[PDB]
Design a protein around this ligand. Structure first.
Ligand code: CYC
Ligand code: CYC
Ligand code: CYC
Ligand code: CYC
Ligand code: CYC
Ligand code: CYC
Ligand code: CYC
Lengths: 160, 162, 66, 35, 160, 162, 162, 160, 162, 162, 160, 160
């Protein structure tokens, strides 16, 4: 969070928060209302976004769901879409928090070793995150599109 | 550390759930009080030395034996250590008030503080009284709405030592 | 023989790092005499090139006062 | 580890020079002109 | 300034400016004219602010202008008022810049050593700047008063 | 480092004078340009990868000997460093443009870069055409209005290497 | 760390006696099993990633709550730490098998592991189950005799944790 | 003390005491009797010394006991004289110890923090220390006066 | 740490009291003993290697199991560790004798030595025997008057270990 | 850093010969005025703060341009740096006076000071005036015998700058 | 031991043993029988090596047995030969181990301080080690002589 | 010397000399005449002290002069007595300095490895310096003999 990062910076230096840090917190709490609106809009549309992104990905990369592919079968495709839902929830958490810290903690630290143990392709994950960004930004407003796409591009770079 | 936003995020992430109405209500309740928290933190930062003054004077007026020979705060070194500890308590109470959470008190202040004071011979009751004195002195400066917020974190520290 | 003035170039051979590190590669610094043997060894370990060394504070060939 | 768990030197000998996460403490580096 | 703070934070983290501090820069440049009008409103009132603050300080601390004090005599009281002039000008610089950076870099770094060299008591300085804060906030409306008081009480805390 | 606003503050602090009308003329000029500067900076940050892509591509097309064996750019590490230097130049040019002053270019980039390159054997001239390629790409991308603004900082970097 | 040879050397140095026939017999037995040990170690090294993959798949299939929210392996971070711990156990079991002595397990693996996991919150029983799944996977790859050999070290780890 | 300082300076480099340190300890134990005599003469006559030193201090710096001053009032003046008694006791401790060590730990570490938390003006403390030094050296002979003057000089410089 | 002078000073400082006749009597006692203490310290510094030499030889002659195989002092490493510990004991006993107080012995040596030796497997009876060896070896070198003074510090070390 | 004792030791060591009567006469010359040196250093140590107080006061009274805006001493930071330089000069001159050697000034104070001051815009003439102010203020209090011995080192500093 | 050395090296980089380390272990295990036979040969030749090395040392350095020497007397010369027997046993332990680790850990770490606490001249120990090297190389033939000479050489270098 | 040690110790914390360091310097300069007479006495009788010290060494340690020893031969005996000359000169240097720093950094720093490079026994060195101490203290007066003896004891502890 913005507040957590400001407090941690001030505590590391054994000082109270400066006027600039308090100004950052002031701006963050001012923008909290519209960030909550963005997160709630993204939450209400979870089924539509996940479905449309899944079909877009599987049509764009048929080899994942083809026989011998990582997500072939009902259960493995369900696990694929469930990872997509995980990352959508993490994006909403980042929206409310004001930064990518919840995303990093919950789904970015150690992601490559995990997906390497799962034989899950990383380019597939990156394209899935790109499809999620496209679908979500297409559904929601243009002004909120940049804010949401910031976290989506962070996730896409992290898994890349 | 963990603040109110991160506390809600974690309590929902462990459940595996998206934000529901209750979550957004908690987030709204935090965001609504942000201006009060920032104003109080600014006031406390600008008046920290005065708060330490008044709390120390009150504490050593109620218990003058602390700074007299044979007292734990009797020397320039130990008096300096006393006012330094009070400054630490004020700074971390301000941090906990900005965060909306008492986690930083648990993971930067109260972790092993009671056993450290027992080892050093620092009187815990007198330190709790000094924390209370900081609480009254800060409540006057910040105002009632922020005084109530600072009170819960001062009481958290006091219960941690006690 | 108290203080050496050492200038050196230390390229990076193990990583490619995106912060500002121009100050770490090429730098002129003052090293103590007792520190200088170990400092020179450490610089040579990393593949650095030592350009010039000069005596600054102390006087060369002092039997006492060092 | 006070930081990323898989940056422990026992498993990752290069974990000391690994990229810092938000789990790690604040790092203070002096890059100001080193004159 | 705010722009400098954002740039140095970006450079320390070694990446371009994010949309958040870009919005910070946009908000700062959008409010420049209000900062300039506040800087004037303080600037015409140099003498009134400084003299009222000095009167309040010597009301609370008659010992300072008492024989043996630091400000005893007309010339030393003039030096008192001139120091208050410096700090009022620094507050104007901070209001224009958007943050307190000019205030510290010109009048806070090393102030304790300076005033120890000058036998100047720091409590007198904090009382004087608190008096200047109280005087200067009255001249402005609430929106301007809050931000100006932020610089003033930052200066008061730094002097203490 | 020093901004346009900090430059005015410094000029008036050395004189000992308060701000006057001319100071506000300069400050309002910077404030007016600020919207264009932040728009250009956001555009450059969004596409910085692409500017690097095409600038390095055409620089190497003009001077292929760098990437071929026996050339300074010939290594994976040396190519990575070559593109990282261009990233440095783009990012600090964006910094200077958003600040409106060239001080940061002197303090952080140009400070000793000549000697370090000459010691490492890095060709200065090739870096100059690299910066020229970068400024051409940015001028194409961000529009003429911000092109003329980024041109001065890119030329400043080139002249510093020149 | 001591292998069979080092153990013989130490048990003869403590006595102060030189080597006699019995020591040479024990050393000869170790060299007799050395070829089996080297082949098993090479096979395990060649397929470490595979072994970890089926072992973790079996553990998380048998205990699905571990990787679901509220489980100790629910995060990319914690999942990675889990498979890292599994790699620890496999590698040090291979070390102990190659040395022919369980000393390295007590010496570098099982010391303070219970306290560490209890402070972290790691389920001890599930870690033992992961070790047993790793045993089952490793046995099929290494063959009957090498499996019987590796089983004593896997069981040693499981009994040390439990 | 001399013995304590020599022992710690020996222990920090893991060695036995050098001939210089042993010679220093010899000089100290040879001067011990006159050190005790000086501690006597300061100890018995201290009601006097405190009264004359306080009177001289308040004469040379009337501001402290003027309205608004720190020591204004009977009780704060009593606290002032109590501090003077503290420091002269520390001075005798240093004289017997042969070093300024007991003075240093008991009344020099954090003394600026403590007199800031009380807003006791450090120049006033230094003036009081010079007053005590003059009064005390008045009651000692030249050999004793020089020795007590060194400790008073250390105290005054430390508070400065 | 603490010596006799500092001990008296601290007692009177905690009492807030003044140096009375008893304090000056104790100070006179220490100053009277000072020259003997300094002579003994210099003598022990001169012959420290010799004292360790003889004390080690005598301890290993009375208890030859230590240096034979299977003994706690049987290796070059463990023998050198024994000699290093004895050199500490001599140096710190000399420090305590010169100070006239055993606070340095407590804090620098005896606070944690029993647990260190119990964890290392070091025999404590034999260590006390080695301390007594150093005691009566240095007693001959320093002389009867200085021996009576250094003996109390050697017995303090022995009682702290026992 | 080398004194007169160490200077004659150095000469008779590099020559490898013994002390002759000239060396002993020089050592008499050192020891005779060492007592005056100790007196002067003792007086200066307590009055160093005051010496800097009115030394800087007079330096700024005679040249109010430095403290006024546009002067090199105009800021809290640069005023602090100025008085800090004044303290450095006083304390290192005291060290040189006590050691009886001007070598320490050349080693640590006068190494590149002139070019550094021209680099940073420090006025050499005004700094020498400050050195003269310290010299005369100190000689006012130390006494004529100590005044000359301190003025020789202050004049050495001034001639080093100018 | 060779296996212990390889395992420690592999654990240093946190990796399984490479094929090079594995085939090195294979060569060490296959060549065990000859190492045990070499240990035999030095085992039955006990008094021959001990006595010949002692005589060669005492001819090269009669001063050890001369008055004022450390090996003067029957008991001290017996202790000398006991030390030689210790080091011969360590060499045999190294031969079976395939590495000088037993020699190091048992009689090389702290040998300097030990023999300083015994006044034993390290050059005399080196001469005795060289005498043992000569005798042992005399007993063995060919590659066994070279590989035991390597260990005696290591011991001589460590003591020197 | 004493002045150098006090100055470096004070400059370590960038502070003026404590009354303790001033007092040790005062005691050092106060005793300059006696220590310089000691330097006279030692430098006048160099050859005598050196000769009796060599004789006492050779009778106490007949080991060194016997064939195969470090001091066997006329040239090596000459080097022995030459080193004794060096060391007594260093003792005089330390006496005039009042500190063992000249002895330290001329003959003590690196002496262990040096007499290792010369095959010179360190017990021989300590016997040499003890003989030198005995011979010198026999000639010196009662008070001066102790002062010489402390420096000789420092040297003995330094060598071994
Ligand atoms: C909150 C952080 C977090 C994440 C992200 C996470 C992912 C995750 N996905 C898993 C399975 C899976 N995940 C996928 C997804 C892949 N299929 C295609 O290749 C795509 C490239 C890609 C998705 C877009 C698939 C196919 C599986 C099934 C693997 C198997 O059972 O063999 C598993 C194994 C355990 C289980 O199935 O429940 C984890 C831990 N777990 C976490 O705690
Ligand atoms: C032995 C080490 C030691 C010292 C020195 C010490 C000093 C000390 N002085 C105090 C108050 C005081 N001290 C002073 C002295 C000042 N009045 C003038 O300004 C002068 C410049 C100056 C004296 C020369 C005064 C006036 C007070 C009362 C402040 C108040 O009313 O709150 C207090 C607060 C509690 C009390 O009064 O008992 C302490 C602890 N405490 C220690 O443990
Ligand atoms: C822009 C940054 C800056 C500051 C702030 C600054 C302060 C400053 N104040 C000074 C003197 C002074 N300043 C004061 C004022 C103090 N007296 C007390 O009573 C009051 C509590 C307090 C004022 C509120 C006084 C009385 C003097 C005269 C002291 C003397 O000359 O002995 C001086 C010495 C020059 C002179 O005498 O005119 C400086 C440099 N200089 C700077 O470059
Ligand atoms: C933020 C300010 C900053 C700058 C400007 C900077 C430049 C810089 N480039 C370096 C290496 C390098 N730089 C280059 C780039 C050259 N190769 C040629 O093909 C091109 C003409 C040219 C790039 C356009 C190369 C190839 C190296 C590797 C060293 C070598 O092998 O020659 C290095 C030292 C080694 C390292 O990367 O750690 C520095 C300090 N560093 C900084 O911190
Ligand atoms: C070679 C000796 C050795 C061992 C064994 C070892 C284990 C170990 N595992 C850790 C974390 C962890 N370990 C696990 C593993 C658990 N997750 C599931 O529940 C499984 C049942 C189970 C593994 C099969 C997890 C999830 C963490 C992350 C804990 C956290 O971040 O809170 C940590 C703390 C972070 C760090 O690595 O520094 C240690 C020390 N470390 C060692 O040096
Ligand atoms: C296994 C590792 C190990 C070794 C090697 C070892 C050596 C050792 N040598 C000793 C004495 C000795 N060592 C020697 C041998 C020396 N004399 C000559 O100078 C020669 C240069 C040289 C032999 C070649 C002598 C003469 C003594 C008797 C010294 C004495 O009794 O004071 C002692 C003391 C015996 C006791 O206190 O009962 C030990 C322990 N100890 C160990 O734990
Ligand atoms: C311990 C030995 C030592 C010496 C001798 C010393 C002199 C010294 N003074 C310096 C700065 C300075 N020196 C001064 C003092 C000048 N201002 C003028 O008004 C006066 C005429 C004059 C003093 C009387 C000032 C103002 C600075 C700061 C300049 C700046 O930062 O731009 C600096 C450079 C540090 C910096 O960049 O801030 C040095 C090296 N420093 C040392 O560490």
């Amino acid at each position: 969070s913005v507040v957590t990062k400001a407090i941690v910076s001030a505590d590391a230096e054994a000082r109270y928060l400066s006027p600039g840090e308090l100004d950052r917190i002031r701006g963050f709490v001012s923008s909290g209302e519209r960030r909550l609106r963005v997160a709630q809009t993204l939450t209400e549309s979870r089924e539509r976004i996940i479905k449309q992104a899944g079909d877009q990905l599987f049509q764009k990369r048929p080899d994942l769901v083809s026989p011998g592919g990582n997500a072939y079968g009902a259960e493995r495709t369900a696990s694929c879409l469930r990872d997509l839902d995980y990352y959508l929830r993490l994006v909403t958490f980042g929206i409310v928090a004001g930064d990518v810290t919840p995303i990093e903690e919950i789904g970015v630290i150690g992601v490559k070793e995990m997906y390497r143990n799962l034989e899950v392709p990383l380019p597939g994950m990156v394209e899935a995150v790109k499809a999620m960004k496209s679908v979500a930004t297409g559904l929601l407003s243009g002004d909120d599109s940049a804010e949401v796409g910031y976290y989506f591009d962070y996730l896409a770079g992290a898994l890349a | 550390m963990q603040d109110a936003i991160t506390s809600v995020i974690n309590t929902y992430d462990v459940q595996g759930k998206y934000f529901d109405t209750s979550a957004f209500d908690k987030l709204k309740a935090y965001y609504a009080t942000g201006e009060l928290r920032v104003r109080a933190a600014g006031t406390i930062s600008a008046n920290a030395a005065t708060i330490i003054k008044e709390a120390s004077a009150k504490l050593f007026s109620n218990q003058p034996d602390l700074v007299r020979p044979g007292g734990n705060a009797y020397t320039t070194r130990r008096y300096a250590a006393c006012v330094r500890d009070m400054d630490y308590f004020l700074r971390y109470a301000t941090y906990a008030m900005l965060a909306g959470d008492t986690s930083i008190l648990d993971e930067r202040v109260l972790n092993g503080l009671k056993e450290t004071y027992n080892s050093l011979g620092v009187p815990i009751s007198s330190t709790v009284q000094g924390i209370q004195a900081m609480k009254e002195v800060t409540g006057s400066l910040v105002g009632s709405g922020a005084a109530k917020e600072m009170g819960v974190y001062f009481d958290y520290l006091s219960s941690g030592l006690s | 023989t108290r203080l050496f003035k050492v200038t050196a170039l230390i390229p990076s051979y193990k990583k490619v790092r995106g912060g500002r590190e121009l100050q770490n590669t090429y730098f002129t610094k003052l090293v103590e005499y007792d520190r200088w043997f170990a400092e020179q060894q450490r610089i040579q370990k990393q593949g650095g090139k030592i350009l010039s060394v000069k005596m600054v504070a102390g006087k060369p060939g002092l039997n006492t006062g060092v | 580890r006070s930081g990323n768990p898989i940056t422990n030197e026992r498993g990752n000998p290069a974990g000391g020079i690994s990229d810092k996460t938000s789990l790690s403490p604040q790092i203070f580096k002096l890059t100001q002109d080193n004159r």
